[PDB]
C-alpha cells in the first residue's frame, strides 16, 4: 500500500492488467456455456458459431479503448465505465430481433438471458477495483 505516493499514472496504469486479465478469460469461458447450453436444448440456429463471436465482439471491440481511458484519462469514479454498461445492454437489443432471422428454442431463450447479463455485471468490476484505490487516497 502506497503512503506518500499520492500520483497516479505509472502504478494505476499496471492495475488494468487485472481487469484486463479476466476480461481475456470470461471471453472464452462464455462462448462455451453458451453454446453447451443452446445445444443441450437443440442448438438450433442459421449462422455459424462464429458469427456469436463476430457479433458479440464487434461492439465490444469500440469499447475495448474504455479499458484504457478509464486507467489513464480518469473523468471520475466511473465516467467511462458507465458508458461501457450502456454498449452491452444496448447492444442486446439488436441481439434480440435475431428471433426474426433464425429463431429456434423459445426455452433457450430465457435461459441464456442469466448468461447474456453475466457479462455484463462482471464488467462491473471496473469499479469494484477502483474502489479500493478511493479508499487510499483520500485517506492518503
Request: with cysteine.
Amino acid at each position: 500500500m502506497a503512503h506518500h505516493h499520492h500520483h497516479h499514472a505509472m502504478v494505476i496504469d499496471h492495475i488494468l492488467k487485472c481487469v484486463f486479465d479476466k476480461i481475456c478469460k470470461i471471453g472464452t469461458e462464455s462462448v462455451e456455456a453458451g453454446r453447451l447450453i443452446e445445444l443441450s436444448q437443440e442448438g438450433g440456429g442459421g449462422g455459424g458459431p462464429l458469427y456469436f463471436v463476430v457479433n458479440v465482439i464487434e461492439p465490444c471491440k469500440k469499447f475495448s479503448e474504455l479499458t484504457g481511458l478509464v486507467f489513464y484519462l480518469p473523468t471520475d469514479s466511473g465516467e467511462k465505465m458507465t458508458e461501457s454498461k450502456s454498449v452491452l445492454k444496448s447492444l442486446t437489443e439488436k441481439l434480440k430481433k435475431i428471433v426474426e432471422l433464425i429463431p429456434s428454442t423459445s426455452s433457450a431463450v430465457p435461459l441464456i438471458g442469466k448468461y447474456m447479463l453475466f457479462t455484463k455485471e462482471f464488467v462491473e468490476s471496473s469499479i469494484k477495483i477502483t474502489e479500493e484505490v478511493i479508499n487510499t487516497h483520500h485517506r492518503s
